Design an enzyme around this catalytic site. Sequence first.
Site, PDB file in Angstrom:
ATOM      1  N   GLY B   8       7.144  26.078   7.151  1.00  0.00           N
ATOM      2  CA  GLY B   8       6.568  26.682   5.962  1.00  0.00           C
ATOM      3  C   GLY B   8       5.443  25.891   5.330  1.00  0.00           C
ATOM      4  CB  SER B   9       4.650  22.289   5.412  1.00  0.00           C
ATOM      5  OG  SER B   9       3.566  21.448   5.042  1.00  0.00           O
ATOM      6  N   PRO B  10       2.217  24.420   4.091  1.00  0.00           N
ATOM      7  CG  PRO B  10       1.601  25.372   2.046  1.00  0.00           C
ATOM      8  CD  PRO B  10       2.677  24.536   2.693  1.00  0.00           C
TER       9      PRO B  10
END
Lengths: 188, 188
Positions: B8-10
């Site tokens: 999920g980490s941008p």
Amino acid sequence: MDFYQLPGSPPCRAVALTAAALDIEMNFKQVTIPTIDDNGFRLWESRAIMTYLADQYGKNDTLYPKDLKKRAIVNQRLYFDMCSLYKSFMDYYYPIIFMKAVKDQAKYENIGTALSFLDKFLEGENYVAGKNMTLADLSIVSTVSTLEALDYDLSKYKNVTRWFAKIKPEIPKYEEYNNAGLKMFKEL
Amino acid sequence: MDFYQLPGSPPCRAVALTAAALDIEMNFKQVTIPTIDDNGFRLWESRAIMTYLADQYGKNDTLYPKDLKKRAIVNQRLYFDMCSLYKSFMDYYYPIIFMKAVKDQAKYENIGTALSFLDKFLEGENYVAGKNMTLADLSIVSTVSTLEALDYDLSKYKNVTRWFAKIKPEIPKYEEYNNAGLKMFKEL
């Protein structure tokens, strides 16, 4: 090249130190600063200006190594300086200095956290981002010297204190292009 | 090369998109992320990773032009993305998403301010930082797509909306390496 700046501004001093280290003359204008106008090429974002000037006008690549791994480390330190160190300095001092707002202890501690990271980067190291003084040293010193000018105690950060003390003599024209503009902070 | 990430980490998705655009295989590890381990060279700071990968493994320089003026503009947009756009997204949503704290309207408005700057950068332009898609497009889209996933309305930012819609089809493996990891946000 025109250099739109403000003598006290830390990002302006980072660019001015960079120009001094590369022996570049700039036409200093007083007024998003800093901005350079390089024969029609307008560029803002201090750190983008610094890496542009190093590649375009650096005689050797010691300040900004062409080697991709060494360059990546300089780049990594420039992001940290901009997003953590410089941002946290601004977030705590600017409301106090300019709006005479009340000290924010949470914002104050963010400064300490940023410096602890910087202190870790400098463990066992002469410079913030490699074997030689790089652009990252010039960028970070513009904020660290402004902290000292505002009477922030750095002695706890013994690697930061060690680095700061030995770096000031190495930086070309440090007195003229950084120390001088610090006077506004020492008087408030 | 090992790639330590979180789907999920941008910033992780910005690196993953970069690897996809350069056709680089990475050994994805799950756990400061992202970090790459490139045969012993450890590197953190998403954007420093992105510019390292482009120069070290890019077949052509379209994503990160060697031309110093064009490169400086990409660099300038990467700083903006990291310090203004991404930071403001984090500052407002992360306490809400993770700590279920109360919405901060001041932090919410900082998102809008960052997007207005992005919207101005894209006026009359196909891409955020030059005539072609660059690393800055891949970096910024990782945050903009996360805003949309969190039901932030971007239609007011008609240049941002225009750019986002035309950029998703151009980005190699956009669905696999960015869209997929957005699922955590759409469910909360």
